[PDB]
Amino acid sequence: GALCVIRFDNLAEKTAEQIISILDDNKKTEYTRLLADAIRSLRRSSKLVAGLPKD
């Protein structure tokens, strides 16, 4: 099924549980889907963490 030539001679798990514990220690648990989407959007480059917004 291909062309041929024939010739003869862990770091994500603990950070995830940290963030889950932070969200469950407070009453902000409906913000989990949005956090997942925002981080998978941060996936693009590493220079987007220093430019996160403020209020």
Side-chain angles (χ1 to χ4, degrees):
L3 279 185
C4 77
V5 177
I6 310 181
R7 45 164 75 87
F8 36 80
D9 269 27
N10 57 328
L11 197 59
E13 298 97 312
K14 54 188 294 185
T15 316
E17 54 82 18
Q18 266 196 65
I19 293 170
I20 282 164
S21 89
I22 279 179
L23 291 156
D24 63 44
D25 263 10
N26 298 161
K27 312 302 273 300
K28 313 297 216 276
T29 294
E30 75 261 21
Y31 290 134
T32 41
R33 178 81 181 271
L34 194 59
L35 272 169
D37 284 349
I39 293 160
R40 207 191 168 87
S41 159
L42 278 168
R43 182 255 316 262
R44 185 161 90 262
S45 157
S46 169
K47 294 301 180 48
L48 269 78
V49 189
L52 281 188
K54 282 147 203 294
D55 64 336

